Write a protein that binds this ligand. Structure first.
Ligand SMILES: CC(C)(COP(=O)(O)OP(=O)(O)OC[C@H]1O[C@@H](n2cnc3c(N)ncnc32)[C@H](O)[C@@H]1OP(=O)(O)O)[C@@H](O)C(=O)NCCC(=O)NCCS
Ligand SMILES: *C(=O)CCCCCCCCCCCCC
Ligand SMILES: [Cl-]
Lengths: 8, 393
């Protein structure tokens, strides 16, 4: 499955 | 508990994954081949679920069953680090991702409560020809592993993995490729998400992104403003007549990378022919009528949890971008404009393939999430992100 990222 | 770093993972002991044919986290791999031979007899019976649960292969052609899968993922699938956002795969997107050419109903492996019939678990495989270094292999792509929140930490994920492995083995396939935001034994490559603000005011309002150290809101918006129309000559949506040339361009372009798909022309049609709110593909047809480039991004919105006013984040994800005449940076610049035009709030892209050549110049901000790439029952040296040429939904 995927990974939810958001800006550091 | 899952580790996010190779150093924090190397402390950990992997009860399930030690039993699997994957390399150990610590060991270094100087070989190319299967971890174990193919099995010539496969277990015929489904693995035992805990009392009160049953297997059920989901017929996604039934509108009601597809809606059940949407709800399970909408309520229990991947969240960000801080439990603020969750993937909101649409029903139509799930059909696109789970019924490509060669899909099998038994590979839509769900778990139901015996009494209520409530869908509480899911895992999926789709067939894919995968080129890894110098070997081309028929494999499966594993995706959408989901255990209901009320069922977590009960060892239900390993039985889902073993059951889909059994069902894939029954079809004569013994390797798989999959991604994860956690570290497991053992990544073939580590990719990093980057993010390009398109509606920076909504992103900051919902705390997806944050104002940089010394920048106003007015300044952040001027920084991220984009033209209203793309600049590249001859850019237009992909059409049926473009399927062969898109297949040709993609096949040649991917040869420079070490982990790539190998798509038939039918698979190129499925994965790239534009479907509104699912997949967008734009080709560059030049002054001679020749298609020389194309860009693509898929639609994956996210639920914003516990917000009274903003309910959803509309994200576009970089898919496959092939350049042979148009510079990649011009190509991706037009992708941003097109995404902005279509109402997306953010444009996401990984640092794989040649993406690092444009991420910073186009004002992407590095993300907090790694995407680890893994192979099942295949031993090979790891590779840098720029050598990964495979994008999954
Ligand atoms: C991911 C998920 C299915 C794991 O289920 P869980 O109930 O929390 O963990 P379980 O008790 O069932 O079993 C844990 C085992 O599964 C492993 N595991 C955990 N997450 C995993 C993942 N994404 N992929 C493969 N294995 C995973 C663990 O490493 C552990 O094995 P180990 O003994 O070798 O360490 C569940 O947390 C979930 O649905 N999360 C939201 C959706 C999601 O993240 N899907 C996976 C996307 S990569
Ligand atoms: C995202 O949901 C991926 C979750 C990865 C689970 C591990 C899958 C391991 C491979 C199983 C198939 C084996 C085929 C031989
Ligand atoms: Cl189906």
């Amino acid at each position: 499955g995927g990974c939810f990222s958001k800006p550091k | 508990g899952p580790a996010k770093t190779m150093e924090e993972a190397s402390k950990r002991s992997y009860q399930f994954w030690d039993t699997q044919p994957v390399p150990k986290l610590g060991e270094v791999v100087n070989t190319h081949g299967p971890v174990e031979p193919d099995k010539d007899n496969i277990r015929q019976e489904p693995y035992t679920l805990p009392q009160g649960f049953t297997w059920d292969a989901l017929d996604l052609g039934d509108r009601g069953v597809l809606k059940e899968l949407y709800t399970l993922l909408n309520e229990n699938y991947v969240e960000d680090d801080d439990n603020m956002f969750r993937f909101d795969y649409s029903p139509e997107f799930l059909l696109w991702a789970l019924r490509p050419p060669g899909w099998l109903p038994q590979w839509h492996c769900g778990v139901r409560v015996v009494s209520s019939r409530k869908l509480v678990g899911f895992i999926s495989a789709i067939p894919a020809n995968i080129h890894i270094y110098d070997t081309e292999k028929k494999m499966v792509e594993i995706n959408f592993l989901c255990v209901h929140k009320k069922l977590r930490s009960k060892r239900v994920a390993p039985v889902l993995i073993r059951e889909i492995t059994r069902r894939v083995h029954l079809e004569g396939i013994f390797q798989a490729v999959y991604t994860a935001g956690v570290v497991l034994p053992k990544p073939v490559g580590t990719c990093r998400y980057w993010h390009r603000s398109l509606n920076p005011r909504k992103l900051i309002e919902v705390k997806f992104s944050h104002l940089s150290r010394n920048m106003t809101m007015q300044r952040t918006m001027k920084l991220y403003r984009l033209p209203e129309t793309p600049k590249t000559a001859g850019l237009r949506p992909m059409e049926t007549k473009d399927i062969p040339v898109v297949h040709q361009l993609l096949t040649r372009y991917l040869k420079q990378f070490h982990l790539t798909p190998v798509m038939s022309q039918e698979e190129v049609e499925h994965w790239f022919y534009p479907q509104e709110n699912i997949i967008d593909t734009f080709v560059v047809e030049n002054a001679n009528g020749e298609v020389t480039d194309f860009l693509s991004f898929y639609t994956l919105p996210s639920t914003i949890m516990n917000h009274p006013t903003h309910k959803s984040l509309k994200a576009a994800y970089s898919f496959y971008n092939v350049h042979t005449q148009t510079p990649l940076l011009d190509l991706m610049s037009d992708a941003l404009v097109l995404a902005k035009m279509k109402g997306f709030d953010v444009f996401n892209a990984l640092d794989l393939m040649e993406n690092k050549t444009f991420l910073e110049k186009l004002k992407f901000g590095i993300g907090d999430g790694n995407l680890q790439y893994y192979l099942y029952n295949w031993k090979c040296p790891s590779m840098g992100a720029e050598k990964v040429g495979l994008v999954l939904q």
